[PDB]
Amino acid sequence: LRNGESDTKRNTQSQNEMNRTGLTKQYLIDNLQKLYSMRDTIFKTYDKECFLHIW
Amino acid sequence: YGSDMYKYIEQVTDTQSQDLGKAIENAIEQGQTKDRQQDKGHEEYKDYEDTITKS
């Protein structure tokens, strides 16, 4: 006559960490056309208000 | 002007990425075992041999 007994305890602890980055640049001609007058638009507001307008 | 214009001429998309992962897993396992055996034996026997000689 043979008897027995068993017992187990498995305990796992884990940690993860993921750092994903990216950078996508799209070149379109439509952006160059809109680029043209960004700087010039600054001084249209200066000229309209601050300066004289008759020769 | 310059060479960069060609990038806009034919739509070019530069894409990058970087994934940096880390993972630590810790597992602890414990086990116990207990056995018990109990046996019994018993054997019995009988023999008879009769020898008769003439000379």
Side-chain angles (χ1 to χ4, degrees):
Chain A
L1 163 59
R2 191 196 334 267
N3 303 38
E5 187 165 18
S6 303
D7 188 348
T8 60
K9 294 180 176 57
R10 183 179 57 80
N11 154 275
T12 68
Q13 331 183 304
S14 147
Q15 293 182 6
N16 304 337
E17 174 158 8
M18 172 87 77
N19 291 355
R20 216 53 261 166
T21 73
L23 181 163
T24 302
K25 313 189 311 185
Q26 326 173 20
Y27 304 71
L28 318 176
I29 276 175
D30 305 341
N31 274 357
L32 253 68
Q33 301 178 354
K34 311 214 291 169
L35 188 32
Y36 192 15
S37 62
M38 311 275 258
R39 297 205 177 181
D40 215 10
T41 308
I42 308 277
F43 306 111
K44 290 181 181 172
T45 51
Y46 278 111
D47 193 358
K48 145 63 151 173
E49 322 198 19
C50 299
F51 285 83
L52 199 63
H53 291 271
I54 168 155
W55 281 51
Chain B
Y1 282 96
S3 325
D4 220 356
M5 188 29 166
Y6 99 86
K7 173 204 161 308
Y8 304 74
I9 273 174
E10 33 202 349
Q11 300 180 184
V12 158
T13 74
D14 298 0
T15 286
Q16 279 184 356
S17 283
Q18 185 178 16
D19 311 348
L20 309 180
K22 295 155 52 175
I24 170 178
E25 187 195 45
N26 188 336
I28 298 184
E29 335 166 31
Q30 332 179 37
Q32 286 92 283
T33 304
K34 164 202 161 103
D35 297 4
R36 189 76 176 270
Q37 175 180 11
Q38 298 171 356
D39 283 328
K40 264 192 281 203
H42 164 101
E43 311 286 90
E44 71 204 340
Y45 69 119
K46 324 182 61 53
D47 307 69
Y48 323 99
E49 288 277 32
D50 319 327
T51 67
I52 331 178
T53 67
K54 294 152 201 93
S55 61

Short mmCIF file of all heavy atoms in Angstrom, two decimals, chain B residues 45-49:
data_model
loop_
_atom_site.label_atom_id
_atom_site.label_comp_id
_atom_site.label_asym_id
_atom_site.label_seq_id
_atom_site.Cartn_x
_atom_site.Cartn_y
_atom_site.Cartn_z
N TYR B 45 5.93 -23.54 2.35
CA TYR B 45 6.24 -24.60 1.40
C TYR B 45 6.32 -25.94 2.12
O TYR B 45 6.50 -26.01 3.33
CB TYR B 45 7.55 -24.33 0.65
CG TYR B 45 8.79 -24.43 1.50
CD1 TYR B 45 9.78 -25.35 1.22
CD2 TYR B 45 8.97 -23.60 2.60
CE1 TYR B 45 10.91 -25.45 1.99
CE2 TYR B 45 10.10 -23.69 3.38
CZ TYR B 45 11.07 -24.61 3.07
OH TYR B 45 12.20 -24.70 3.85
N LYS B 46 6.18 -27.01 1.33
CA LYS B 46 6.25 -28.38 1.81
C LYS B 46 6.94 -29.23 0.76
O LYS B 46 6.74 -29.01 -0.44
CB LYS B 46 4.85 -28.95 2.09
CG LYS B 46 3.85 -27.96 2.65
CD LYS B 46 2.51 -28.62 2.95
CE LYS B 46 2.66 -29.71 3.99
NZ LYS B 46 3.34 -29.23 5.22
N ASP B 47 7.76 -30.18 1.20
CA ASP B 47 8.44 -31.10 0.28
C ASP B 47 8.46 -32.50 0.86
O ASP B 47 8.48 -32.69 2.08
CB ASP B 47 9.87 -30.65 -0.02
CG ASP B 47 9.96 -29.22 -0.51
OD1 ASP B 47 9.71 -28.31 0.29
OD2 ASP B 47 10.27 -29.02 -1.70
N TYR B 48 8.47 -33.49 -0.03
CA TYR B 48 8.60 -34.90 0.33
C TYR B 48 9.39 -35.60 -0.76
O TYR B 48 9.05 -35.47 -1.94
CB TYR B 48 7.23 -35.57 0.47
CG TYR B 48 6.15 -34.72 1.08
CD1 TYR B 48 5.22 -34.07 0.28
CD2 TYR B 48 6.04 -34.57 2.46
CE1 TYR B 48 4.22 -33.29 0.83
CE2 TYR B 48 5.05 -33.79 3.01
CZ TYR B 48 4.15 -33.16 2.20
OH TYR B 48 3.16 -32.38 2.76
N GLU B 49 10.42 -36.34 -0.37
CA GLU B 49 11.16 -37.15 -1.33
C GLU B 49 11.58 -38.45 -0.66
O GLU B 49 12.23 -38.43 0.39
CB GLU B 49 12.38 -36.41 -1.88
CG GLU B 49 12.05 -35.26 -2.85
CD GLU B 49 11.80 -35.72 -4.28
OE1 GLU B 49 11.28 -36.84 -4.48
OE2 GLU B 49 12.11 -34.94 -5.21
#
